[PDB]
Amino acid sequence: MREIVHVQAGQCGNQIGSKFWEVISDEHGIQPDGTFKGETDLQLERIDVYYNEANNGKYVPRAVLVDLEPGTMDSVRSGPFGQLFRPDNFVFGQSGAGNNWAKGHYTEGAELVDNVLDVIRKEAEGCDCLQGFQLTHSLGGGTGSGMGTLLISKIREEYPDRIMSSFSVVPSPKVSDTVVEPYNATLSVHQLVENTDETYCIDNEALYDICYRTLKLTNPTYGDLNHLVSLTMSGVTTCLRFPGQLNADLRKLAVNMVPFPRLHFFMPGFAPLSAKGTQAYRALTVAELTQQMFDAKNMMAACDPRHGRYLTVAAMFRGRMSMREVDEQMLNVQNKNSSYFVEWIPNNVKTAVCDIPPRGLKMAATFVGNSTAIQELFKRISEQFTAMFRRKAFLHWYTGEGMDEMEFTEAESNMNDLISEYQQYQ
Amino acid sequence: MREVISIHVGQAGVQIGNACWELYCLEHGIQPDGTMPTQSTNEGESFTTFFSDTGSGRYVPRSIFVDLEPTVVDEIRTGTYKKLFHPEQMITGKEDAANNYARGHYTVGKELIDTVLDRIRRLADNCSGLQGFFVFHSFGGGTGSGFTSLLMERLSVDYGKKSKLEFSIYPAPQVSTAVVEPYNSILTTHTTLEHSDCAFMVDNEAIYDICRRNLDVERPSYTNLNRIISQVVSSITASLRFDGALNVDLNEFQTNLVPYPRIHFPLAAYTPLISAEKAYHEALSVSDITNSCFEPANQMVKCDPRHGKYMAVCLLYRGDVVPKDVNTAIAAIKTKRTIQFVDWCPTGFKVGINYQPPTVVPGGDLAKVPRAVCMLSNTTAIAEAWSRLDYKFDLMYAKRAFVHWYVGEGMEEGEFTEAREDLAALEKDYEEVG
Numbered sequence: 001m002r003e004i005v006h007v008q009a010g011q012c013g014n015q016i017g018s019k020f021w022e023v024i025s026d027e028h029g030i031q032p033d034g035t036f037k038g039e040t041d042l043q044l045e046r047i048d049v050y051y052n053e054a055n056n057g058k059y060v061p062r063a064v065l066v067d068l069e070p071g072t073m074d075s076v077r078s079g080p081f082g083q084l085f086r087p088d089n090f091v092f093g094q095s096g097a098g099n100n101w102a103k104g105h106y107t108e109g110a111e112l113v114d115n116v117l118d119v120i121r122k123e124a125e126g127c128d129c130l131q132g133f134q135l136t137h138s139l140g141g142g143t144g145s146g147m148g149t150l151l152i153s154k155i156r157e158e159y160p161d162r163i164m165s166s167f168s169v170v171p172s173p174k175v176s177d178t179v180v181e182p183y184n185a186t187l188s189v190h191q192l193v194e195n196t197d198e199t200y201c202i203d204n205e206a207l208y209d210i211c212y213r214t215l216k217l218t219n220p221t222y223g224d225l226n227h228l229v230s231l232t233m234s235g236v237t238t239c240l241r242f243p244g245q246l247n248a249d250l251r252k253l254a255v256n257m258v259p260f261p262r263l264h265f266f267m268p269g270f271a272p273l274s275a276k277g278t279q280a281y282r283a284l285t286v287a288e289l290t291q292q293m294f295d296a297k298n299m300m301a302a303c304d305p306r307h308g309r310y311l312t313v314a315a316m317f318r319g320r321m322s323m324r325e326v327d328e329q330m331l332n333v334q335n336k337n338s339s340y341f342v343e344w345i346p347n348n349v350k351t352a353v354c355d356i357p358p359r360g361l362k363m364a365a366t367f368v369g370n371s372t373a374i375q376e377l378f379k380r381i382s383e384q385f386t387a388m389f390r391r392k393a394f395l396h397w398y399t400g401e402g403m404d405e406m407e408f409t410e411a412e413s414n415m416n417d418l419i420s421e422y423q424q425y426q
Numbered sequence: 427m428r429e430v431i432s433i434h435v436g437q438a439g440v441q442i443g444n445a446c447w448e449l450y451c452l453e454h455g456i457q458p459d460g461t462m463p464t465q466s467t468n469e470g471e472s473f474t475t476f477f478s479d480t481g482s483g484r485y486v487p488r489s490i491f492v493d494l495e496p497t498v499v500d501e502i503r504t505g506t507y508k509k510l511f512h513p514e515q516m517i518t519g520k521e522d523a524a525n526n527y528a529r530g531h532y533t534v535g536k537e538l539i540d541t542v543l544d545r546i547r548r549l550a551d552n553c554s555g556l557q558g559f560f561v562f563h564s565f566g567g568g569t570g571s572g573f574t575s576l577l578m579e580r581l582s583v584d585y586g587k588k589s590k591l592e593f594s595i596y597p598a599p600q601v602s603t604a605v606v607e608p609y610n611s612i613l614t615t616h617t618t619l620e621h622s623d624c625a626f627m628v629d630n631e632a633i634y635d636i637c638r639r640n641l642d643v644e645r646p647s648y649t650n651l652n653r654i655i656s657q658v659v660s661s662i663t664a665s666l667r668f669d670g671a672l673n674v675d676l677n678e679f680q681t682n683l684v685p686y687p688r689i690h691f692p693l694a695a696y697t698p699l700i701s702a703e704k705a706y707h708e709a710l711s712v713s714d715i716t717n718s719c720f721e722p723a724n725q726m727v728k729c730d731p732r733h734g735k736y737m738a739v740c741l742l743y744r745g746d747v748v749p750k751d752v753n754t755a756i757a758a759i760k761t762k763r764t765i766q767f768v769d770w771c772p773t774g775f776k777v778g779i780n781y782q783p784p785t786v787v788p789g790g791d792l793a794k795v796p797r798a799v800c801m802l803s804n805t806t807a808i809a810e811a812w813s814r815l816d817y818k819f820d821l822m823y824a825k826r827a828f829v830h831w832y833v834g835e836g837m838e839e840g841e842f843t844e845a846r847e848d849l850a851a852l853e854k855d856y857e858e859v860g
């Protein structure tokens with residue numbers, strides 16, 4: 001009915017979903033063969049939203065897997081849950097972006113965009129009414145930040161109506177990951193502020209600080225860092241997949257939060273988060289799960305929450321909970337932290353409660369916030385972007401591909417107007 | 427005979443209707459599968475206002491479930507109450523409006539409004555005594571506001587003279603969820619003044635205060651809050667579903683309680699509303715709970731009743747109550763002077779006593795008490811509840827926040843301006859009449 005495809009592009013977003021589909025497989029009781037083994041039909045009555053059942057119940061995920069090389073194809077294919085994906089969707093090229101935007105946008109990405117465009121068309125023809133798209137890619141690299149950038153510019157020609165979830169990792173102030181990382185940011189966000197509806201700026205740096213303090217894990221496996229990205233995304237779409245006392249789709253999560261057609265740059269949060277041995281020694285109350293959500297520890301990005309203001313507080317609570325204690329404490333945070341909110345927007349808390357917790361807990365909280373300290377995310381990169389344009393370095397990897405110099409400065413003016421709009425209401 | 431139709435629009439329409447029709451199966455002795463046991467025929471005395479007869483005692487509810495989302499409707503189509511309702515009375519939607527007006531006033535509603543008005547007319551042509559409408563809605567919902575205003579815009583064209591009743595939830599000034607609820611409450615007040623006979627409001631918090639103190643329920647949720655509202659719903663119907671000495675129909679409620687056709691918005695109250703243990707150490711008389719009606723820990727909207735001015739206070743009693751102390755206690759209310767009237771209305775009283783005491787839900791938190799009062803009190807504390815919501819709407823409107831959802835859905839921005847001058851004189855009229 002309400003149907004959503006999930007598209008992965010670039011080496012980052014290809015392995016995020018590879019652990020993320022597993023939880024979606026396990027929350028609904030299916031197998032790598034797609035065999036339904038859920039005991040209660042609560043895991044079946046909304047199985048259709050991410051799946052297209054065909055020929056005796058082998059559910060295929062509504063997923064598209066795109067790469068510029070066959071390197072990341074076989075690793076997902078031979079890895080865990082490799083037999084579940086449809087081999088019709090395994091569309092790829094033979095180039096590799098080499099961390100170059102105009103290769104991923106103009107040169108090499110312009111060839112492979114036509115093949116999956118019909119694949120976007122094909123699964124959307126077999127449904128009654130689409131709902132919106134979710135997209136995992138990168139903003140630091142070259143493949144996902146160059147090819148997935150152009151894909152959103154052609155979805156609006158097909159479907160100018162629905163919503164666009166563009167989940168992508170962002171640079172950190174501490175240690176840069178790639179050399180052209182400020183180049184891959186300003187040129188991407190130039191297209192992200194044009195035709196997208198939400199981005200979740202997840203820092204790679206602060207995810208260790210989550211794991212180093214709460215999880216206390218000395219050996220961060222990349223399966224485990226995306227596992228904390230996995231449980232964040234499954235809590236967002238819990239209303240469309242499970243009943244409860246209050247349901248809230250992705251459009252209701254959209255319409256409650258974004259106040260102006262640019263300011264939709266949100267950071268996520270999740271509670272509870274701790275190691276193994278601290279299970280019994282703390283309390284599973286509404287009050288203990290409340291104050292964890294509003295700490296700098298729970299900030300998945302490396303921005304300071306007491307250097308901004310919460311505009312729209314989204315509380316997606318999961319589990320059998322008492323509504324009044326939710327109604328109690330969401331009042332109590334504004335009686336404590338009235339400076340920490342925007343002042344002219346009253347009643348900043350939006351609450352959506354499904355009565356089903358995720359697997360592994362008894363009561364959880366999925367937070368998405370809007371701090372105006374995310375203005376500093378675009379303050380720090382606009383200087384690093386203009387750190388190398390003043391010396392015109394690496395121009396022969398872009399103009400040699402055929403990039404305009406004004407393509408930098410047009411993005412550079414719209415980058416600096418963006419932080420003026422957080423400044424408008426702060 | 428007399429037959430009343432119910433309409434359930436929005437998710438608040440779904441589960442409140444999942445409690446009220448659940449409660450009526452207890453108070454008439456009807457099994458939830460659809461048929462009746464033969465023991466409850468003598469209890470079934472004039473139950474014809476809601477339940478058509480079919481084949482052999484099989485009683486469909488004259489009820490319509492309207493939703494733009496198929497999720498919570500499937501809860502009805504999973505539980506025990508699936509076989510009770512009629513399938514073509516269930517009309518579902520597919521794409522959600524997400525608490526937006528023109529998404530619920532134009533987009534998904536106009537593809538489904540022609541299907542449901544037939545099902546109105548298919549059922550109402552059986553009636554020879556069609557009295558009124560139970561329409562349940564919210565104030566901030568997409569179909570709670572956008573479709574509800576459009577629905578009442580069309581039934582007044584169809585039926586007109588016949589009555590209507592609206593039940594809804596007053597949005598709290600402190601604790602509420604959706605940010606567009608100051609927007610849509612101004613929108614659902616705009617064109618529903620002309621197209622609604624009466625509309626009632628309750629607070630989430632004003633339920634909670636009696637739940638924590640008197641019920642001693644320190645984990646309440648939307649399960650038990652539906653039961654408490656449904657007792658107020660059932661107490662109005664006890665004047666119609668049974669044979670009382672001095673009772674009242676739906677045309678008479680609006681005739682007493684509407685002094686002027688714009689100010690027609692009273693609220694509710696219920697007492698005794700306590701747990702099962704505290705009624706043991708106390709003999710609740712008539713003068714006990716009637717004096718409990720007019721204290722601010724008993725109103726169902728969290729506001730200041732002493733800063734409001736009572737204009738027409740309506741009283742419906744249930745259980746074996748003698749009228750002597752009734753004629754004393756209401757006079758004993760008048761011996762107290764804190765209950766303020768207006769200078770022109772001393773005679774704004776309504777007397778209603780039914781023989782049947784309220785019967786409590788099985789497995790619930792209530793106690794079997796013979797005496798109960800459903801207090802209805804139109805007052806000028808509604809105006810003080812207008813100013814707390816008119817403050818929220820205008821300041822977010824001044825910065826033009828969240829306008830970029832209302833634009834492209836087939837909606838104009840000058841309609842926001844006309845509702846401001848519309849609601850400004852409304853709260854003036856409480857002070858003008860008062």
Ligand SMILES: Nc1nc2c(ncn2[C@@H]2O[C@H](COP(=O)(O)OP(=O)(O)OP(=O)(O)O)[C@@H](O)[C@H]2O)c(=O)[nH]1
Nearest residue numbers: 436437438441523524525530564566567568569570
């Ligand atoms: N207490 C309580 N309130 C409810 C319930 N269902 C809806 N509401 C209220 O309804 C208001 C918003 O309307 P919704 O029900 O969410 O949306 P809708 O009426 O279905 O309209 P759409 O947006 O078109 O789906 C919220 O502020 C809730 O307070 C319920 O089951 N219990």
Ligand SMILES: Nc1nc2c(ncn2[C@@H]2O[C@H](COP(=O)(O)OP(=O)(O)O)[C@@H](O)[C@H]2O)c(=O)[nH]1
Nearest residue numbers: 010011012099138140141142143144177222225
């Ligand atoms: N958390 C996490 N981040 C990753 C992983 N793989 C790549 N990244 C991030 O992706 C960025 C590099 O982009 P990438 O897609 O690998 O380069 P591209 O293939 O040329 O587009 C780096 O900043 C990495 O932090 C992973 O397995 N886990």
